Amino acid sequence: TEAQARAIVNSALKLYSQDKTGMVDFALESGGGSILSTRCSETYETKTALMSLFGIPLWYFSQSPRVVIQPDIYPGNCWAFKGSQGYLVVRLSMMIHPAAFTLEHIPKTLSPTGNISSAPKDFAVYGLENEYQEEGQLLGQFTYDQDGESLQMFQALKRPDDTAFQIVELRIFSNWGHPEYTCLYRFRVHGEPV
Amino acid sequence: TEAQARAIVNSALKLYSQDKTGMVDFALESGGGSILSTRCSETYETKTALMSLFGIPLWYFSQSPRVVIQPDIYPGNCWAFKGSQGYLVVRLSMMIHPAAFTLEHIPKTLSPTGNISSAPKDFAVYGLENEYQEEGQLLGQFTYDQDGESLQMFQALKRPDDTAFQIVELRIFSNWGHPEYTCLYRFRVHGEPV
Amino acid sequence: TEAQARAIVNSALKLYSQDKTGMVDFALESGGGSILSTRCSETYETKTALMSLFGIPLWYFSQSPRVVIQPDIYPGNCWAFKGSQGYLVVRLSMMIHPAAFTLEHIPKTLSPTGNISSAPKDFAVYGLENEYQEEGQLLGQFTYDQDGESLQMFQALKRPDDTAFQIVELRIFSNWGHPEYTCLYRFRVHGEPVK
Amino acid sequence: TEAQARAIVNSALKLYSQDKTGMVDFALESGGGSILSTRCSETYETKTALMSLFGIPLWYFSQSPRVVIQPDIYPGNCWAFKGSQGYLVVRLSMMIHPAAFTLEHIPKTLSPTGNISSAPKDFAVYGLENEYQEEGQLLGQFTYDQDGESLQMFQALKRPDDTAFQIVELRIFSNWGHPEYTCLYRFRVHGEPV
Amino acid sequence: TEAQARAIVNSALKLYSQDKTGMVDFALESGGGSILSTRCSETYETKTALMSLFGIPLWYFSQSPRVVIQPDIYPGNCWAFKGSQGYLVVRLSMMIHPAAFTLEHIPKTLSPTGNISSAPKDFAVYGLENEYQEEGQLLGQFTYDQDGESLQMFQALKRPDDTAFQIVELRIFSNWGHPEYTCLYRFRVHGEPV
Amino acid sequence: TEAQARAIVNSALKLYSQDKTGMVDFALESGGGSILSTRCSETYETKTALMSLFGIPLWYFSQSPRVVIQPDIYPGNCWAFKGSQGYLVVRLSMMIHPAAFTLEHIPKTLSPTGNISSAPKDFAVYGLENEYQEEGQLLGQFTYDQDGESLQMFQALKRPDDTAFQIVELRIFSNWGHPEYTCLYRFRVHGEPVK
Amino acid sequence: CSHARIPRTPYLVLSYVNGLPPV
Amino acid sequence: PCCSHARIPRTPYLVLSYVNGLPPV
Amino acid sequence: CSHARIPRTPYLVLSYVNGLPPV
Amino acid sequence: GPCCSHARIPRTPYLVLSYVNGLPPV
Amino acid sequence: GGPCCSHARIPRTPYLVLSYVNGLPPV
Amino acid sequence: GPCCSHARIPRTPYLVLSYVNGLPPV
Ligand SMILES: [K+]
Ligand SMILES: [K+]
Ligand SMILES: [K+]
Ligand SMILES: [K+]
Ligand SMILES: [K+]
Ligand SMILES: [K+]
Ligand SMILES: [Zn+2]
Ligand SMILES: [Zn+2]
Ligand SMILES: [Zn+2]
């Protein structure tokens, strides 16, 4: 327990450096994931972050759904949609059997308003066989706990047949009380390739 | 006692993942903070980082004051002003009672010259009631220790009237001996919202 | 051993926050490092990452050699060249005596294909006195272990009269079996600057 | 008859150089005229003139309604709208009492197809008091003769109350047989300013 | 004789206004003509007309082969190729039987050097059935007279079999003595459509 | 008598087609002429011709001094300077002995306001050896007649030494009564090149 | 390819907002 | 803020799409 | 809005640095 | 004006016009 | 390959300014 | 997605960074 204690700290650091989970994120944009923007909710328009150049105002900056599959989860590095109900369709990097999903949101200790009421509360994950499929196959129905850790994992449902999926839809049903919008910081898809 | 060791390392990693402090940074740009470029020192121009495209030189790259409220603190991800005296005005994300300030600089073990003479040495923090206020209320005079840790925190002064502020001015009075410029990697503002 | 264990974990985190090595990376772009694009291999053409704006397709995105001297090592943040043989020339931030080199690659547990066969296997590091020098002084020939840790360090060759260099060439001789390309995530150069 | 001949030819050249009419064109764009692009018919889409740069196709080129108040009337320098019915509203350079209108079209001897069936046949001119007025005051109804000269002038109707106008609407009711589109090369407005 | 004189001058002005020839130019760009850039010689590089914006040099301006099928023939509105031998391939607006060709060059009275030695001297016109043809059918070999008028017309050869063409190649074999380049101001193609 | 008449009409059209003068315009931009932009007057700012794209206002359009050496002289195709006093320095296409100058303005019958009071009235032409020369050699003091023809030509002054020039300055001293600006449609320089 | 990158024709609109231009 | 009602362009969204499989990883 | 995005009215300047263009 | 003798100022950008769907409106 | 010169085409070094004009962004 | 088969979409624009006046501020 003298040298073993150093082995635990190095193992914890090794797991922390491996995207904090040590599992492949088939939704990660840099690794092959992509957003099907034509099947996502309308981005919440805020019109506050004014980008200018040489004193010339150019445009207002707002985060796109792409940030949900990007690792930077500092406060604000999140995609927001109007209301408490939204959908996000992600094309996975490979055709996999989905096994688990990961949702990340900032802790209460880092939010300026002192709360994470913009975080999603009730959501479901679906598997789509093609881009144009309206109703997909239910992969699971979960609840993100605001009193839990920042990173929360959710085990996918065992589908009866060995049906693979490369397109995933994230349907948010409710948030934690924010009356205007709902923010998604990062959404990950884990599983086994075919 | 293996579970106690895992609990200690996991608690340290949890605090490390929460912006290394577990406290709201009301100056963070992505969270709502912004730089008042009208009331900042002129950026030290070096004209060394030449950006080119198709062999056509386009412009020289230099970090703006925006990086001081951005988390990346790798060597070079810092705003520099000429000399050893400079000022930086940041608009906080919310109207807060300032309680502490955080200054970050690269350690000597990561600096190419083997020392951090460009780091600020003596500074003071002021609270401004409006953008055009010439003289603000002194919130505290501190000294960044070059022989200290990379991240250094400074407790704000206790004042009779706890007047709140949404605009903070960082006045650098001296550096640690660099004859050309002074670098600011990250400056954070912590407190309690109204 | 309780307070000592807290000292151990805090010391480990301190080394972790200092670029995971606590040593100066004279090749880091933000710190002064730069890529000599002419003296580097051609980028592997994939034409898959289609960048569009207002529905207008603009161009296909591919990582340039610059990412190799950038810290972000998430899967995909790597420069790839065709085949298993390539060369990367980096201009160091300062004239230094090279002492060690660091090569980083993603672990197999984060690769979508389940393997890191695109990682380099056999490589060598050379020291160049000028930009136009074809073949420089050999600083060390090493082998990146696919079964080793993600970050691997390599000690430079010892020499009696230490000649300094500000330009280093990384020559990849083989990969770990990928038939198309070879990926470099991050390459670091460590040493002592000249007085 | 020698000096008489030269004086006649020089007078003809003098009238030719003065915009072929020697009369003010209060609709001319360079002189103050402008097209109310909102109050015009939808431009006929052809998608044939592919503009490219470095082998990259950029866009298809089509003449805007602005060309109708531009003097260059070479074949193709005309605005076309789908069908045989179209609207064109021009804001005059000055508040004038309209007295005459000029319509220009290419001669058949310069048309590639051997006909000028795309030219307008029956049209009317209206006077509008404001931008959003739907139905204006009728200034005249005329017919462009396909067998006449390239430039044809039309005298406006005399009115009891001399009401001035700075906005004119050109309504094309029919063309000379082209089944696809109708082309307008140049439309001029003449009168006396207030 | 006054009415006879007015009819003579008005007929001359009518022919002058109809592109100075009263004949369809099936090579005119605005009328449907286009240049095959991959089937033309390289533009003579001068590096003298420096275009700048806000003091920033952008590029050197040189006329492309497109101006040859554009009506503006003021001095300089011409495409130049290196040497005294060059090729220009034009796609006609319609499939026609070529009957005549027109070559235009500035008069000596408008040239700064006092000569038109950059003008072409010996040339030939060929008809191509498709773009991929290398050597086409000879439509005529002519000579532009430097002592002649600015506009010179050339009758195509008589053919027993009536073969139509929509692609024309203009081959310049020699100029009028300019040692550096050869300039083409305007080239027209006349004929009867099918 | 008929062939003589047709020869007269063809000669008039031939002179008309040759830039209406049959003389070389060494100030013409497309032929080699250029405006020395620094050595000019301040352009009259109106902020009325708003150029927009997709409903986004981009900039206000105003004619530059370049239009004075461009042939299009339709109403509005003119450069305007504030007041009734202005300068225009033109670099000729070749080193020539100046013999005549041409000033063009729209006729009164084509102006919307019914007058050409914005036209220049009294002017002088000078020859400069370099761009930075403050006061040059007087080539002629002339007056543009508002009651004259649209195109008016002016013979250069007979000087004892036929000194050649490649830089010409046009100094406008007065206009025909416009209280705000003065418009120049086209200014031409004629002469004989050096050999 | 023959498909344009920009769907509609880029149309620069000219509007007079402060009266006549210099003539 | 140039005036009371400013015509600021719509928020630009740079879209990334994978159309030919995996990128080099 | 009616305020121009570019404060200066733009102006493409043409200057000849290497003699005559092809005429 | 160019900045130095080694300055690479580009040549003329050449906007090419091609007719791919027949005649334009005439 | 690399840049053919060391003189920048743009005289002054650009800076993208970010300013919040309508309150907080979504967090 | 590409509009047609083998749309000629240009390659990657490569923003090159070069240090010509020594170290940046660190
Ligand atoms: K994110
Ligand atoms: K920073
Ligand atoms: K990297
Ligand atoms: K027109
Ligand atoms: K031409
Ligand atoms: K003009
Ligand atoms: Zn405004
Ligand atoms: Zn230079
Ligand atoms: Zn296509």
| C-beta separation of L24 from B77 below 8 A | no
Closest CA to A141 of A174, A94, A179: A174
Residue to mutate among E74, E113, E116, E152, with most F CBs inside 10 A, is E74
Under 8 Å CB-to-CB from A158, ≥6 apart: which residues? none
Measure the CA–CA gap between A174 and A121, rounded to whole angstroms. 5
In Å, how far is B2's CA from the nearest CA of chain K? 38
| C-beta separation of D80 from J25 below 8 A | yes
CB atoms within 10 A of CB A20: 16
Closest CA to E47 of E57, E58, E61, E64: E61
Angle at CA of residue F101, ends F96 and F102, nearest 5°: 135
* A64 alpha carbon – ligand 3 mean position (Å): 23
Q: Classify strands D165-175 and D181-184 as parallel, antiparallel or unpaired.
A: unpaired
CB atoms within 10 A of CB B158: 8
User: Amino acid letter at D131?
Assistant: E
Q: What residues pair up with D181 in beta bridges, in sequence order?
A: D82
| C-beta separation of E42 from E98 below 8 A | no
Measure the CA–CA gap between F10 and F18, rounded to whole angstroms. 12
> C-alpha distances in angstroms, C71 versus A14, B73, C77?
17, 11, 9
| Contact residues, chain G, for F76 at CB < 8 Å | 21-23
| C-beta separation of E23 from E88 below 8 A | no
Measure the CA–CA gap between B27 and B22, rounded to whole angstroms. 15
| Distance of alpha carbon I20 from the chain centroid | 19
> C-alpha distances in angstroms, K13 versus B24, B69, C29?
33, 20, 19
> C-alpha distances in angstroms, C109 versus A25, A98, C68, C146, C155?
10, 16, 21, 12, 27
Tokens of F158: 């007979």
| C-beta separation of E95 from E168 below 8 A | no
* B87 alpha carbon – ligand 3 mean position (Å): 34
CB atoms within 10 A of CB A4: 9
> Rounded to 5, what percent of chain E is helix, strand, coil?
15, 40, 45
The neighbours of chain E, by the rule of 3 or more Cβ pairs under 8 Å, are D, F, I, J, K
Give the total residue count for chain J: 26
Measure the CA–CA gap between A33 and E76, rounded to whole angstroms. 55
Do C and J make contact, counting contact as 3+ CB pairs within 8 angstroms?
Answer: no
Instruction: Determine whether the interchain pair F193/E114 forms a contact, defined as Cβ–Cβ distance below 8 Å.
Output: yes
Give domain limits for chain C.
1-195
Measure the CA–CA gap between C25 and B1, rounded to whole angstroms. 39
Under 8 Å CB-to-CB from F56, ≥6 apart: which residues? H7, H9, I5
Closest CA to A169 of A64, A63, A32, A36: A36
Phi, psi for D103 (deg, rounded to 5): -120, 130
| Contact residues, chain L, for K2 at CB < 8 Å | 16, 18
Measure the CA–CA gap between L13 and E189, rounded to whole angstroms. 42
Measure the CA–CA gap between A33 and A96, rounded to whole angstroms. 13
Between helix D2-17 and helix E2-17 the angle, nearest 10°, is: 40
Is F4 buried (19+), middle (13-18) or exposed (0-12) by CB count in 10 A?
exposed
| C-beta separation of E185 from E110 below 8 A | no
* D121 alpha carbon – ligand 4 mean position (Å): 18
Restricting to C residues 16-35, those with a Cβ less than 8 Å away from any Cβ of B are 17-19, 22-26, 28-32
Q: Which residue of F has its CA nearest to G22?
A: F76
> Rounded to 5, what percent of chain H is helix, strand, coil?
0, 20, 80
Tokens of K13: 């070094």
Measure the CA–CA gap between B73 and B61, rounded to whole angstroms. 17
Measure the CA–CA gap between F163 and F159, rounded to whole angstroms. 8
Under 8 Å CB-to-CB from E46, ≥6 apart: which residues? E60, E62, I18, I19, I21, I22
Widest pairwise Cα distance in chain F: 64
Q: Which residue of G has its CA nearest to D62?
A: G9
Measure the CA–CA gap between A152 and A120, rounded to whole angstroms. 12
* I2 alpha carbon – ligand 7 mean position (Å): 6
Between helix A4-17 and helix B2-17 the angle, nearest 10°, is: 30
For tokens 């959710």, name the residue: A154
Secondary structure (3-state) at F153: strand
Q: Classify strands E86-104 and C49-53 as parallel, antiparallel or unpaired.
A: unpaired
> Rounded to 5, what percent of chain G is helix, strand, coil?
0, 20, 80
In Å, how far is B7's CA from the nearest CA of chain L? 37
